[PDB]
Amino acid sequence: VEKVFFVTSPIYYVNAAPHIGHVYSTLITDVIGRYHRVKGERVFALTGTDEHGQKVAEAAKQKQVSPYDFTTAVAGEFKKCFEQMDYSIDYFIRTTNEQHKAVVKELWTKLEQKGDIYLGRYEGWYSISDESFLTPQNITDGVDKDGNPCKVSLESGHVVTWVSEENYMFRLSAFRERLLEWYHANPGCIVPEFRRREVIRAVEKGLPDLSVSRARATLHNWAIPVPGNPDHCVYVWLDALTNYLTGSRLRVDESGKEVSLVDDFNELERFPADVHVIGKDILKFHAIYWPAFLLSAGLPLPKKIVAHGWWTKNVFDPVEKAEEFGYDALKYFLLRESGFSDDGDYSDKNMIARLNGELADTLGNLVMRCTSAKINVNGEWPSPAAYTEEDESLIQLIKDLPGTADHYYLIPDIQKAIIAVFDVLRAINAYVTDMAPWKLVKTDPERLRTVLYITLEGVRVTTLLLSPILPRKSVVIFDMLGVPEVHRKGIENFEFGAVPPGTRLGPAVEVLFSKRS
Numbered sequence: 421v422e423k424v425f426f427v428t429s430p431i432y433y434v435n436a437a438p439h440i441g442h443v444y445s446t447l448i449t450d451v452i453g454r455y456h457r458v459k460g461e462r463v464f465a466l467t468g469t470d471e472h473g474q475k476v477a478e479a480a481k482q483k484q485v486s487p488y489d490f491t492t493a494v495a496g497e498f499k500k501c502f503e504q505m506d507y508s509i510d511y512f513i514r515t516t517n518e519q520h521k522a523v524v525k526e527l528w529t530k531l532e533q534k535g536d537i538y539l540g541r542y543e544g545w546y547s548i549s550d551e552s553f554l555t556p557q558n559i560t561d562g563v564d565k566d567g568n569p570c571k572v573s574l575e576s577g578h579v580v581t582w583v584s585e586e587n588y589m590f591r592l593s594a595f596r597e598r599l600l601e602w603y604h605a606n607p608g609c610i611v612p613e614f615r616r617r618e619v620i621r622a623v624e625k626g627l628p629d630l631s632v633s634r635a636r637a638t639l640h641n642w643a644i645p646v647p648g649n650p651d652h653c654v655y656v657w658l659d660a661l662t663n664y665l666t667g668s669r670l671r672v673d674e675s676g677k678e679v680s681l682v683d684d685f686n687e688l689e690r691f692p693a694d695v696h697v698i699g700k701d702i703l704k705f706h707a708i709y710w711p712a713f714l715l716s717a718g719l720p721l722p723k724k725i726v727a728h729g730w731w732t733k734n735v736f737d738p739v740e741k742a743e744e745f746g747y748d749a750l751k752y753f754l755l756r757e758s759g760f761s762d763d764g765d766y767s768d769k770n771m772i773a774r775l776n777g778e779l780a781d782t783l784g785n786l787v788m789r790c791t792s793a794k795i796n797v798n799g800e801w802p803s804p805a806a807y808t809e810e811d812e813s814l815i816q817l818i819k820d821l822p823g824t825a826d827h828y829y830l831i832p833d834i835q836k837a838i839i840a841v842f843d844v845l846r847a848i849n850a851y852v853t854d855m856a857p858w859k860l861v862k863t864d865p866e867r868l869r870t871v872l873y874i875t876l877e878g879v880r881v882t883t884l885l886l887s888p889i890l891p892r893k894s895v896v897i898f899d900m901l902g903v904p905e906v907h908r909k910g911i912e913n914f915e916f917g918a919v920p921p922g923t924r925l926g927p928a929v930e931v932l933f934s935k936r937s
């Protein structure tokens with residue numbers, strides 16, 4: 421099934437300013453998008469803002485601004501942040517958008533016509549900050565912003581309150597068996613695996629029905645009205661989850677503005693999402709509620725949900741650190757340092773160790789050696805002579821790398837993809853040290869041709885596979901190597917030997933990554 425590769429980030433609450441969590445989630449989305457573009461596929465990458473609900477309106481109230489003005493301002497800060505971070509996101513969605521509201525109303529009506537929405541009651545605990553319903557087993561005692569005694573969430577530590585309201589209810593309990601069949605039939609649908617096991621255990625225990633509306637006064641009228649009942653508003657999470665459906669149905673112009681909402685999602689070939697990137701804090705919403713809504717509506721389910729170790733909802737300003745250390749270097753560090761965990765060192769010391777050790781010493785040094793005037797005297801890609809067994813061992817690593825890295829990118833597991841590329845870079849470095857091509861200029865010119873060609877080609881292939889991670893630096897590297905534009909993307913260029921001998925190197929000026937103290 422040839423379709424548009426559809427990758428999403430969460431849509432972020434606009435109660436507060438952009439921070440590292442939001443930047444991190446969207447970075448992962450961006451990298452996955454970029455890898456699939458390098459591979460030659462059509463890609464639609466989506467990010468955005470979640471603008472309705474009690475928590476947004478109360479934040480606007482604290483600042484003494486209208487919710488309309490507040491959300492527009494904070495949305496602008498997110499947009500500016502993602503422009504500065506140099507992502508390649510295809511559309512930035514806002515839940516205040518009138519086309520999004522239309523889609524929410526269509527979906528609501530469909531669910532109602534199916535008999536899956538009924539009028540009932542929610543009597544229980546609720547976290548306003550997480551916009552989440554909680555059972556009594558998910559609460560404990562704690563303190564609020566002042567220090568007085570109250571109940572808090574076990575998940576997040578935020579304050580919980582008791583709600584008693586007549587509400588529209590989604591019959592989530594009826595979808596337990598179908599959800600379990602989906603999990604078992606598609607064992608790669610939630611990543612990483614231990615988070616998949618958590619979701620399955622939760623659904624095995626039983627599912628209550630889910631309140632999908634609230635009384636309008638409780639949301640300070642800052643929400644989408646229920647179709648046919650203006651006393652009620654749509655639950656911010658059904659509103660929010662639906663952004664993925666809306667985004668899949670928007671025609672977007674060259675400047676990034678939506679120009680049209682299509683009726684049928686199949687027209688644009690995006691839905692369902694190939695990858696939903698999320699933080700671990702919103703797993704239940706994406707792995708239980710969302711597929712239940714889609715099953716109810718008769719819509720296709722997403723292929724993968726990837727849940728990272730960080731939270732979504734001692735300063736670490738990403739734009740400040742990127743100005744200090746470099747944008748590509750920061751992106752590299754964030755993706756290299758952690759897999760699916762919080763355990764990981766984000767200090768200036770470790771940042772410098774990885775910058776110096778991996779980017780400067782391993783990658784950078786290797787790029788300078790194979791392009792240097794001392795070693796590469798003709799300033800071109802030489803034609804290789806016969807290969808030794810040691811040459812063939814390195815060639816085999818380079819040939820195997822695209823297959824290996826591709827599998828890791830598709831999990832997706834970006835940390836392992838990076839590690840696999842750097843294992844090959846270390847092997848190329850060891851080979852260059854062994855062969856000592858600086859001595860071979862005088863002693864054995866024929867042998868240097870072979871050594872230099874293999875080095876150039878190893879640097880090209882590794883750089884291609886790192887281009888989703890280091891998009892700006894990869895362009896500089898390809899320019900130094902003199903790699904034509906046509907050879908900078910497409911699965912055809914993952915093969916060893918794609919750049920012919922005779923190709924002239926690009927002109928010299930000059931540091932790729934400068935080391936720090």
Ligand code: MET
Nearest residue numbers: 430431432433470660661
């Ligand atoms: C449909 S993704 C919603 C994410 C949510 N607004 C959050 O910030 O956690």
